[PDB]
Amino acid sequence: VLHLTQDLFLPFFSNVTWFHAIDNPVLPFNDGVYFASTEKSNIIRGWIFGTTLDSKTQSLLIVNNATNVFIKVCEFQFCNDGVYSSANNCTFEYVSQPFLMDLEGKQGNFKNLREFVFKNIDGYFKIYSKHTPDFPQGFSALEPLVDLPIGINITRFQTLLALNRADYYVGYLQPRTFLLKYNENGTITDAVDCALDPLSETKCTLKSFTVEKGIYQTSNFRVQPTESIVRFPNVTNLCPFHEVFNATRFASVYAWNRTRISNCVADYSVLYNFAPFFAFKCYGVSPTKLNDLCFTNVYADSFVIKGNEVSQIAPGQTGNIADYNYKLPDDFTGCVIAWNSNKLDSKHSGNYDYWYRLFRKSKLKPFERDISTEIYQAGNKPCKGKGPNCYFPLQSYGFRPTYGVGHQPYRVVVLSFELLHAPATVCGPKKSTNLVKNKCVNFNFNGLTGTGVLTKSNKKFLPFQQFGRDIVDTTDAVRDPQTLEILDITPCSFGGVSVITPGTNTSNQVAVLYQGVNCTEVSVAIHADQLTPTWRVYSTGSNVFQTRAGCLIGAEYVNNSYECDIPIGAGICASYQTQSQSIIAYTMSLGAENSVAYSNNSIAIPTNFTISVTTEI
Amino acid sequence: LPVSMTKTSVDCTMYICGDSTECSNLLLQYGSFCTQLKRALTGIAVEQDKNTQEVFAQVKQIYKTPPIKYFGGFNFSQILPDPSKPSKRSPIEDLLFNKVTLADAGFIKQYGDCLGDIAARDLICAQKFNGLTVLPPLLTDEMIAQYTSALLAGTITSGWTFGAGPALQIPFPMQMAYRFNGIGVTQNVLYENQKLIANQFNSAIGKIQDSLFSTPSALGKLQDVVNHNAQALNTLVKQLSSKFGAISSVLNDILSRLDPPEAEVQIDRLITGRLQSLQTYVTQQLIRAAEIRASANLAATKMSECVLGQSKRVDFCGKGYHLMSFPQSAPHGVVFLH
Amino acid sequence: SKFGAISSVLNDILSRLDPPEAEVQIDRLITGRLQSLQTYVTQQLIRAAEIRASANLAATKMSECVLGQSKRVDFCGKGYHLMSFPQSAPHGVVFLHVTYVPAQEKNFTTAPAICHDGKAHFPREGVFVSNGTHWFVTQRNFYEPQIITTDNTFVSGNCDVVIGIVNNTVYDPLQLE
Amino acid sequence: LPVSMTKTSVDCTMYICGDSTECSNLLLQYGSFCTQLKRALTGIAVEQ
Amino acid sequence: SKFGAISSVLNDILSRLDPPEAEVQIDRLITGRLQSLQTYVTQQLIRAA
Ligand SMILES: *[C@@H]1O[C@H](CO)[C@@H](O[C@@H]2O[C@H](CO)[C@@H](O)[C@H](O)[C@@H]2O)[C@H](O)[C@H]1NC(C)=O
Ligand SMILES: *[C@@H]1O[C@H](CO)[C@@H](O[C@@H]2O[C@H](CO)[C@@H](O)[C@H](O)[C@@H]2O)[C@H](O)[C@H]1NC(C)=O
Ligand SMILES: *[C@@H]1O[C@H](CO)[C@@H](O[C@@H]2O[C@H](CO)[C@@H](O)[C@H](O)[C@@H]2O)[C@H](O)[C@H]1NC(C)=O
Ligand SMILES: *[C@@H]1O[C@H](CO)[C@@H](O[C@@H]2O[C@H](CO)[C@@H](O)[C@H](O)[C@@H]2O)[C@H](O)[C@H]1NC(C)=O
Ligand SMILES: *[C@@H]1O[C@H](CO)[C@@H](O[C@@H]2O[C@H](CO)[C@@H](O)[C@H](O)[C@@H]2O)[C@H](O)[C@H]1NC(C)=O
Ligand SMILES: *[C@@H]1O[C@H](CO)[C@@H](O)[C@H](O)[C@H]1NC(C)=O
Ligand SMILES: *[C@@H]1O[C@H](CO)[C@@H](O)[C@H](O)[C@H]1NC(C)=O
Ligand SMILES: *[C@@H]1O[C@H](CO)[C@@H](O)[C@H](O)[C@H]1NC(C)=O
Ligand SMILES: *[C@@H]1O[C@H](CO)[C@@H](O)[C@H](O)[C@H]1NC(C)=O
Ligand SMILES: *[C@@H]1O[C@H](CO)[C@@H](O)[C@H](O)[C@H]1NC(C)=O
Ligand SMILES: *[C@@H]1O[C@H](CO)[C@@H](O)[C@H](O)[C@H]1NC(C)=O
Ligand SMILES: *[C@@H]1O[C@H](CO)[C@@H](O)[C@H](O)[C@H]1NC(C)=O
Ligand SMILES: *[C@@H]1O[C@H](CO)[C@@H](O)[C@H](O)[C@H]1NC(C)=O
Ligand SMILES: *[C@@H]1O[C@H](CO)[C@@H](O)[C@H](O)[C@H]1NC(C)=O
Ligand SMILES: *[C@@H]1O[C@H](CO)[C@@H](O)[C@H](O)[C@H]1NC(C)=O
């Protein structure tokens, strides 16, 4: 099998930082560490891990000796050289066979290379080792050693040394797709990286080791943005949220006081401070990443209400309050806030100030107030008054400093947002950058986050206009919120990479084509290192060609004409032709040019014949 | 007769999740679902190229018309290439190329003027905005005319021998006499009414140009192809702004307003919906490609039989008794003059 | 493939959640696996139609070329068709078309009609050809030089209306005997 | 030899939502998944 | 066919459940009834050729 894996691996031909030993610096840890060491008998003992290497964060030790290992998850303090001096919160010890196996054929020339790789995916620290008796380039597998659930925030990677009277090869793994050739016995014999060369990416896609002659469409390129420009509204006014949240007479649910929040910058850290959160359930918006939003209008209704009616208030609920006092819209784009207020709605001897409704002729439609004093009719009597068969619509929301959890004066204020296609007046606190033109840059126009090349536009943008689209309803021109100018929005760069290659049984050279983009654009960006493709094909200057079907790099243009071999596009074909061999680009030859000799009285009639047998399938 | 349609290279992740890492990761959970889509589109493109090759590249050697043009009094200047025109196309070719309008040329490298559109960006730029491209045909509209000219020059100087073996020349009056003899009327009638037959040929050739010029749309069959291929791509992109059950059509806004699990539920609704709308387009394209390949096989057969020889089967190469046929190139099609 | 659920193994996902919550899970796994099968069936239908078209063409080619001689050009091979033989192959058939292809050709001379005495003579079949000094008759697809005779030519005309006409004499086997 | 078949003119709104305004509104959120169906049926009829 | 919902008739679904709760089930029935139609159309398109 040629089983292809998307897994954490060390890059091929990557840069291993070679050290020497005759002081043991700390190495950062991120997504695994590869380790190698070529030594005579032993000069390296083991590896310590953890964070900050102190008696405050849990650590690990893989310290080894002659006969075993010493795996333990501990919180050692320090040694500065008996490799630790603290064992307080240190459990999960482990003992197994020693990590090092050394064999010599009656000579020290068998310098075995000891490879090690680790990873901490969802904890579950895995160790892999193998001993093979500058740096050798033969493939050697790495048999897994031990796999146990470490589950600690591993951030810093270190190593030990030995005592005595050309090693330390450290690599760093990243998530890269690999393809491994499994031998018939179950071992692995060859491996290719899928982020190294165009040819490696091609064979990776077809999951094979031999690529027939032809052109293979593999991936798509895109010009990654240089900077990220954000344009948020000129003013920097903090919202009056402070006034809303700490008034002293929050109106009850029957008459839900609705306030207006507009023309302000919305920073909700003050909301977090002014809230001993006891019920911050949110539906339309989430409270964590809330300051990255540009709201057009904000509605701030507040009403003090019971503990269980805090659970009652939600988009599309039911109850004496949710149906007759405050019904939220089913498609509610906004959230509610509730924290306990037993110091302002409570006093000695009682307090019956607040009111609520349990008697309405019909359901209260979402976002509506029905403040009125009309006695509910029961039976058929026109009675207007209080008592039996004549019920007063409103009842008292009695509050005292002594209730249970579900009967306390919970202070509730709701926030309603309109995050739709409209000129937003309320955004989050950010630093508005400047404007860069003719350059792919992430843009954040009043909450319209996207990537695109900006420019000047000769549009006739009306005073009330903000946006512009197509019949496809995709935003095309967005008025600069500050410079009041029209700014077109392109999809930066999006294309497709196709690799022209002869058979790998013949040669291994490749040529790269960037589909539907002209090379003056990509030649600038490749020099500035902004392409999504990391594979970097050579460009000598003789090998650039502007085809009508894209733009080709790595092949030369020869004006001769031949039968097409590798069809590229727009009447262009490339082929591997002897110089002593390279890749050239030529134009198709339709056929051997021939001319007939028509005359007024000339005929040619055949004198002989041949018999031919063809085939059809 | 239509012969081919536009080649398209729709891209999964760009169409479905605009540069969003979370949406790409969640798409990866559906397995090899759109690798099938990419393979199908590649097959469609290769099929289109093969269709045009089969129809047009019927001759291995390109011939050239004699420098003088006097074929027994027959007037042919309306079908052979015009040297003065830069494109080297006959007047009938020019009318055909001017009476068909292509929504997307493809061989434009438009990328770069979309910013300079000044006016609202057009449908081509709009489709380029969200990950859909159109690839250019391998055989340009210029070498198709060269193949057609070779076929035309082979017919009027060598008869039908160039279609079977070597090209043997023979005077046009005698070739026409043999074609007369093939339908059951002797050759002496042609050798008597040579002037009348030449005059009638010239009159018919002249009036076909006026018939094609004055008619509102005699090229409807070719235009329907581009109309359908455009009105499918338009509805593919106009469906990038449907909520599908979520709270908004903007992935950034969904993922700039909400955190982990809720972002998850709404992103998933949108992924399922936009993976359908994409899967429906491929099936329609496959059926249309089958239709176009059948129409191209018919055109290849008609070319081989009527052009490179004389056919006896009735009502195949035009109404009446068959004598000749002349090919003319048209955008995404071929035109026969029986 | 998980299709957006806890796990892809049914016996595994059930024991790790309660039935209806795990059902919300099992229903998602089902609504998936069904789409895969639907796509498979549709693609198989399309390929089946494309294969049936070729099967019909092969049947027509067998009947036409194998069971007789065809006059359609380039149908049964390149050249003038003579015969063909079938051979069976896995999931298909192979035809062996035998065709007749002309060979070495020589430009001679030609003329529409020969005017012996005020009358245009025309070949019954074939062409009038001249070595360069003498006039003859022949076939089309093979050069065999035949002495001009009253049985190889028919007469209709008046020797004043055909262009390219030439002068020579036509012989007859009747006046001699 | 068959020459043609039956011309059908199905309609999504009545089929999936029996005279229900709410179901019609919910169907409206799916975009143009009805116009394509109607166009396909019309093409089939004209072809017959 | 219920398609995973509680009832197969869109008349009690809107008499059992308030609009939002009914919508949950109404969306189940609508996706299911939008497929059957797609399958019908695709088979007819294939059969026409
Ligand atoms: C809800 O209660 C708020 C606080 O009283 C009101 O907001 C403020 O009210 C003061 C009153 O002095 C104004 O000076 C201030 O400008 C702001 O409006 C708010 O109006 C009220 N809303 C409703 C609907 O009752
Ligand atoms: C017609 O063409 C035949 C081949 O296509 C000729 O046959 C050849 O004959 C020579 C000897 O004469 C052989 O050496 C050769 O292998 C082949 O059989 C044939 O002679 C030729 N006839 C004429 C009249 O040109
Ligand atoms: C063959 O037919 C052509 C028609 O396209 C003739 O061309 C015409 O030329 C006249 C002037 O001579 C123009 O006024 C007219 O518009 C057209 O271009 C051409 O002369 C004719 N030649 C022969 C030899 O018959
Ligand atoms: C004209 O055609 C004649 C065929 O009959 C050729 O004449 C031949 O000449 C030989 C002697 O040279 C005679 O013996 C023989 O009977 C035959 O007539 C003659 O070559 C040919 N002329 C040319 C120019 O091709
Ligand atoms: C073939 O021979 C004829 C005589 O047998 C020629 O007819 C002659 O034509 C001339 C004028 O060209 C007359 O003056 C004469 O009386 C006789 O009719 C005929 O021209 C000739 N044709 C060719 C093509 O040589
Ligand atoms: C990595 O190594 C290769 C050559 O050994 C080359 O890309 C470069 O010199 C190195 N990069 C560094 C040291 O940043
Ligand atoms: C290595 O350390 C372990 C743990 O104390 C011990 O059991 C073992 O005997 C040691 N091996 C030696 C000292 O060779
Ligand atoms: C030891 O550390 C672990 C790691 O979080 C912690 O859960 C545990 O409570 C600690 N033991 C103590 C504090 O006794
Ligand atoms: C540290 O490890 C624990 C173990 O599960 C994990 O829950 C926690 O998220 C990790 N720390 C960070 C910052 O993710
Ligand atoms: C109201 O504002 C004052 C300002 O000093 C602040 O101290 C107080 O905490 C606010 N009220 C509430 C309930 O947070
Ligand atoms: C916004 O601020 C910028 C930078 O100071 C200024 O150039 C621009 O004129 C302002 N726009 C408006 C509408 O006030
Ligand atoms: C690519 O080529 C040139 C130089 O960049 C220019 O015409 C334009 O940018 C591109 N071509 C077109 C036709 O847009
Ligand atoms: C050779 O190629 C160059 C461009 O590469 C072209 O300008 C020139 O005309 C060609 N010469 C011939 C004889 O084709
Ligand atoms: C054929 O004859 C015509 C009319 O006599 C003449 O114009 C033309 O040049 C001739 N062609 C050749 C090739 O002799
Ligand atoms: C006959 O002669 C002409 C004169 O150039 C020549 O072009 C033609 O090829 C010849 N035909 C043959 C040799 O069959």
Author numbering:
A (entry chain A): 47 to 68, 80 to 138, 158 to 209, 215 to 246, 263 to 482, 484 to 677, 689 to 726
B (entry chain C): 727 to 1064
C (entry chain A): 968 to 1144
D (entry chain B): 727 to 774
E (entry chain B): 968 to 1016
Quote the paper.
The dense glycan shield consisting of 22–23 N-glycosylation sequons per protomer is an essential feature of SARS-CoV-2 S architecture. The glycans have been shown to play intrinsic and extrinsic roles in protein folding, modulating conformational activation and immune evasion. The transition to the ‘up’ state exposures of RBD for the binding to hACE2 is also a prerequisite for S-mediated viral fusion, directly correlating with infectivity. Here, we dissected the role of N354-linked glycosylation, acquired by BA.2.86 sub-lineages, as a RBD conformational control element in attenuating viral infectivity.
To further structurally verify this, we determined the cryo-EM structure of the BA.2.86 S-trimer in complex with hACE2. Like most complex structures, one or two copies of hACE2 are bound to the RBDs in the up configuration. Consistent with binding results, both the N354 glycan and T356 are located far away from the interface. Surface plasmon resonance (SPR) results demonstrated that RBDs with or without the N354 glycosylation showed comparable binding affinities to hACE2, indicating that the N354 glycosylation does not impact hACE2 binding. Moreover, the binding affinities of the BA.2.86 S-trimers with or without the N354 glycosylation for hACE2 yielded similar results, despite N354 glycosylation promoting the S-trimer ‘RBD-down’ state. However, we noted that variants with the N354 glycosylation exhibited very high affinities to hACE2, reflecting that tight binding might be required to further recover the compromised infectivity.
